[PDB]
Amino acid sequence: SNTPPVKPGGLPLLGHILEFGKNPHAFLMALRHEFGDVAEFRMFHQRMVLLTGSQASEAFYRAPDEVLDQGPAYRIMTPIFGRGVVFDARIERKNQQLQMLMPALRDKPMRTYSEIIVAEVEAMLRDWKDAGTIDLLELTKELTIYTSSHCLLGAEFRHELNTEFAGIYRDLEMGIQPIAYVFPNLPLPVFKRRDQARVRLQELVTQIMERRARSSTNVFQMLIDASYDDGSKLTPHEITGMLIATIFAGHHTSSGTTAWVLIELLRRPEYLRRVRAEIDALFETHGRVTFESLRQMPQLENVIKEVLRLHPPLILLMRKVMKDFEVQGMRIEAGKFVCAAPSVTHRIPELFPNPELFDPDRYTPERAEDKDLYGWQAFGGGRHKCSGNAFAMFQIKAIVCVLLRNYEFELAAAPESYRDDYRKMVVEPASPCLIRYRRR
Numbered sequence: 001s002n003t004p005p006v007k008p009g010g011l012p013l014l015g016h017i018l019e020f021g022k023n024p025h026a027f028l029m030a031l032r033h034e035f036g037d038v039a040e041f042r043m044f045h046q047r048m049v050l051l052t053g054s055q056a057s058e059a060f061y062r063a064p065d066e067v068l069d070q071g072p073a074y075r076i077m078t079p080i081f082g083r084g085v086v087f088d089a090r091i092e093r094k095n096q097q098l099q100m101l102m103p104a105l106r107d108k109p110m111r112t113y114s115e116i117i118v119a120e121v122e123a124m125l126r127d128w129k130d131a132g133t134i135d136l137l138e139l140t141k142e143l144t145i146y147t148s149s150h151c152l153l154g155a156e157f158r159h160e161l162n163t164e165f166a167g168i169y170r171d172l173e174m175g176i177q178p179i180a181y182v183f184p185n186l187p188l189p190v191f192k193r194r195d196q197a198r199v200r201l202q203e204l205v206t207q208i209m210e211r212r213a214r215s216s217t218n219v220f221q222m223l224i225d226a227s228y229d230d231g232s233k234l235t236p237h238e239i240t241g242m243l244i245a246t247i248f249a250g251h252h253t254s255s256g257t258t259a260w261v262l263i264e265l266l267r268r269p270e271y272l273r274r275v276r277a278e279i280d281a282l283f284e285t286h287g288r289v290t291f292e293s294l295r296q297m298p299q300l301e302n303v304i305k306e307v308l309r310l311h312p313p314l315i316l317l318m319r320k321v322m323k324d325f326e327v328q329g330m331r332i333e334a335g336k337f338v339c340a341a342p343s344v345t346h347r348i349p350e351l352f353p354n355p356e357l358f359d360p361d362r363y364t365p366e367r368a369e370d371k372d373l374y375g376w377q378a379f380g381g382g383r384h385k386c387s388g389n390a391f392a393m394f395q396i397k398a399i400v401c402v403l404l405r406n407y408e409f410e411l412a413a414a415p416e417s418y419r420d421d422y423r424k425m426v427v428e429p430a431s432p433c434l435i436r437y438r439r440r
């Protein structure tokens, strides 16, 4: 039929990758502005169709796995995750493993997660000096990696094996290099150290499984106790892969959004006063942080929601088109890729009036702009929506509570200097991001 519009200029081998790399958010904004809800560009030799707006986002998220494949986008992560683990397995096994992941990340385990998250933040606060200058993102990355490793992997990783796991994690993360998009299977020393790190982490998982069989609430144990539709149990390879995938999934996303919550609150003393009022009221009615965060935090909840609207950490959601797909009268042929851009759809004026303004009261029950499910798309949507939704929200909300209760903060640079680095694989606050603290 009528194919989607194609961005007119490009390089032969690279397509639009240079313009994309300069500012990805700007590139996607510009494609929408010039071509519309369904617009095609090229990265290297591959053709991507950006789907923006509620309609096209519904098309994207609502499409079945037999139509839109999640596999190829994760090809770089396969040496870390493992051969037959999530996204490199066939659709059935992939989805069964992901469903195994789902329960451990919501509902009942959250209350046990809460105590340790609060305890970790308190512990870090105790050994700081009374006042100083820190990097906010550095702090949030350390806090979120510690708390999520403890909650999801187990106490063994935060305590006895902490040093070796820190090493293995930095080696694995250093193994996630973009060059692999261009030249896959290129031999690199960082890749050698990544592979060795994965071997060692699988050894550690095997050991801990054996010891736990001799003798806790965590994703590690939920995967030990989980089974397929067949009575077959998960191998140590599969368990180590799925665990490291969850750890990687939540680290930079949650850290960046916590950082942005703090930055925006310090930028806007109105909302900082509202949120601190909520914190001080909850600390009186419900002594201590506790699970009081989970529930009666509406103001901080909406602050986090608007933070995710204006700074969504995942800016491009890519899937290959397996069967001819049609959006808005336009045919997307198999072999093309489709993409969802939360940063672009969140800034559509029809969906969000005055899009560049930061007002968390967009999400009040009276206005309900997060109602579409295919407009506000920070956690994705559909079958493959975020399974770490509640855990991430709670981690952010709890970390902000303990920090804001125990310390008072001042922005160490210009309020307008704090910006997004869209050139990062998971978008985070900009490199300097410095703050000052003094204890209350």
Ligand code: HEM
Binding pocket: 070, 098, 101, 105, 246, 247, 249, 250, 251, 253, 254, 257, 312, 313, 314, 317, 318, 377, 378, 379, 380, 381, 383, 384, 385, 386, 387, 388, 389, 391, 392, 393
């Ligand atoms: C505010 C922080 C977070 C954001 C913005 C976020 C966002 C997203 C998005 C947009 C997707 C869909 C990707 C796609 O469509 O293919 C996704 C998937 C996923 N997220 Fe998150 N996430 C966050 C935190 C977390 C955390 C903390 C965890 C684990 C503790 C987690 C676990 C997952 C998993 C397992 C999936 C896979 C869904 C599937 O493919 O079936 N996420 N996330």
Ligand SMILES: CCCCCCCCCCCCCCCC[N+](C)(C)C
Binding pocket: 077, 086, 173, 174, 175, 176, 177, 178, 245, 246, 248, 249, 252, 425, 426
């Ligand atoms: C269930 C699995 C969901 C997806 C998990 C993996 C998400 C992507 C992890 C990206 C890691 C970002 C940090 C690596 C950045 C690369 N550099 C180290 C070279 C900067």
